[PDB]
Amino acid sequence: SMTDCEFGYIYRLAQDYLQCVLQIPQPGSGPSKTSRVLQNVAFSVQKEVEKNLKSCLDNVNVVSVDTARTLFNQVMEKEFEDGIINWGRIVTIFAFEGILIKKLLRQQIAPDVDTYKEISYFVAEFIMNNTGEWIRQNGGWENGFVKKFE
C-alpha cells in the first residue's frame, strides 16, 4: 500500500539521522536531498534546544534504549497533546532523537550501536502513527517538507 511506501521512507529518514549524528558513513552517494535537508535543520533546532535547556538536560540521564523509549514516548505525547502538528514540530522529533543518542553514548561505558538501531524504529513509529496522516495531507516530504526548508 501507499502506507508502506510512507513507512519505509520515514524509517530511512530516521536511520539516516542516527548515522549523521554518530558520524557514520552510510553507503551509495551519501544521503538523499530530503534527508540532507532534514539533517541540517534538525541539527539547527537540536542545538537551539540544547542551549535553552542546559540547566535542565544536565539532570536528564538516559541509561538504556528502553529508558530512551520511555522518555521519547512521554515527551512526544506531551509535545503533541495540544493537537497541533506542523513541520517544525516534526523536525523536533528528530532533533530530540539526536539528544537521546548523545545522552545514551555519553553514559554507556560500553556503547553498543547495534541496539541504537532500535531508536530509529520507535521514532519512525511515532511519526508514522501520529503525524503520518498530516504528512500525506500536507504535500509529503518531497513537495511538502523540502519546498519549505531547502
Binding site: 533546532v45 534546544v49 535547556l53 538536560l57 509535545e79 513541520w87 517544525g88 532533533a95 519549505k148
Partner: peptide, 17 residues
C-alpha cells in the same frame, strides 16, 4: 522544560521557514 522547548522552538522554526 523539554515539552515546552520542543513546542516553542518547533513552532518558531515553522514560522521562520
Amino acid at each position: 522544560x523539554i515539552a515546552e522547548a520542543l513546542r516553542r522552538i518547533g513552532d518558531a522554526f515553522n514560522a521562520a521557514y
